[PDB]
Amino acid sequence: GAMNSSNYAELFNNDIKLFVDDTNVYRVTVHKTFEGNVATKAINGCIFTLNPKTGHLFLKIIHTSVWAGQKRLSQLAKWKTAEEVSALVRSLPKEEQPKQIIVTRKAMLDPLEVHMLDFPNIAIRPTELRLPFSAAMSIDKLSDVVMKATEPQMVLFNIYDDWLDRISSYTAFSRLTLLLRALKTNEESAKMILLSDPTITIKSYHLWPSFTDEQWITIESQMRDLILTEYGRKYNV
């Protein structure tokens, strides 16, 4: 069934699983028309499909042309997401296909379940965790590849950079969700924390700066401060 605090270490066992987040698939800017009405303009989107054990990110870029001439785009987006995840699974060798897929939003359950009827042994599960994967588009290199795409495209990343050389996948996931929660609560501040130092860079083949173990502890502390702050700045506390 659903995934919660009680079964969190299950994410890091040796059963292949994938998180799927659809919150950046269908993206729009809302604007006024010359007649003073309102209209939307779609922008490129992405499916965020993540193996929490390995860090492997299957970033399927959703080009705006997929919406042309379509109705009820927010509903279509969930079904397009499920079509693309099903296509990804079928493209993987059998021994790489996931045993479970965990959707971050319950509205993805029926679309994914229907598209995966051919795979009755893949469990489709919700979660009670409020995961901050919507903030993936605050990662500069991911936002860049999405906005530059002129056609549908899948790009493969490791969202953990090289962290698994030094830490466990439980700790890597905890760092990732802390960084993403911060970027979601106050993007400018989070980004200042990460990138205000020039001596600590981002390697060409990485997403995040090349922090030493000690600097990660400092960084991680600064992100917790930010989150707790904004939580006061928000609720006045």
Partner 1 sequence: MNTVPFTSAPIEVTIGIDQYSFNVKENQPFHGIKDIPIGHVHVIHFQHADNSSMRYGYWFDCRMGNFYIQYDPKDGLYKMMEERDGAKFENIVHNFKERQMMVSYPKIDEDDTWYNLTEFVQMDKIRKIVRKDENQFSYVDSSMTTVQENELSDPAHSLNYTVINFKSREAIRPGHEMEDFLDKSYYLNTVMLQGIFKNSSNYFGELQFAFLNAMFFGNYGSSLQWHAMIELICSSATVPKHMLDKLDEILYYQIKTLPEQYSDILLNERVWNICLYSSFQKNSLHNTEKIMENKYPELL
Contacts to partner 1 by CB under 8 A: 76, 79, 82-83, 110-111, 113-115, 117-118
Q: Pick between residue 114 and residue 228 the one whose CB is nearest to partner 1.
A: 114
For partner 1, give the closer residue by CB, 17 or 78: 78
**Rounded least distance, CB 80 to partner 1, Å:** 9
Q: Checking DSSP bridges between strand 100-103 and strand 123-125, what pairing results, if any?
A: parallel
Fill in the amino acid letter for 133. Answer: F
> Can you tell me the distance from the alpha carbon of 116 to that of 178, in angstroms, rounded to the nearest whole number?
32
Q: Which is nearer to partner 1, 76 or 164 (CB)?
A: 76
Query: What is the closest distance, in whole angstroms, from the C-beta atom of residue 98 to partner 1 in the complex?
Result: 19
Decide whether 119 or 170 has the Cβ nearer to partner 1. Answer: 119
Smallest separation (angstroms) from partner 1 to the CB of 146:
24
Residue 107 CB, nearest approach to partner 1 (Å): 13
In contact, 164 and 230? CB cutoff 8 Å? no
In angstroms, give the least distance from the CB of 87 to partner 1.
12
> Which C-beta is closer to partner 1: that of 50 or that of 77?
77
- Integer Rg of the chain from CA: 19
Closer to partner 1 by Cβ: residue 113 or 230: 113
CA distance 192 to 204: 20
Query: CB 72 → partner 1: shortest distance, Å?
Result: 9
Whose Cβ is closer to partner 1: residue 28's or residue 76's?
A: 76
**DSSP label at residue 127:** B
Please, what is the Cα angle at 230 between 198 and 131, to 5 degrees?
A: 85
State the minimum distance, in angstroms, from the CB of residue 106 to partner 1.
15
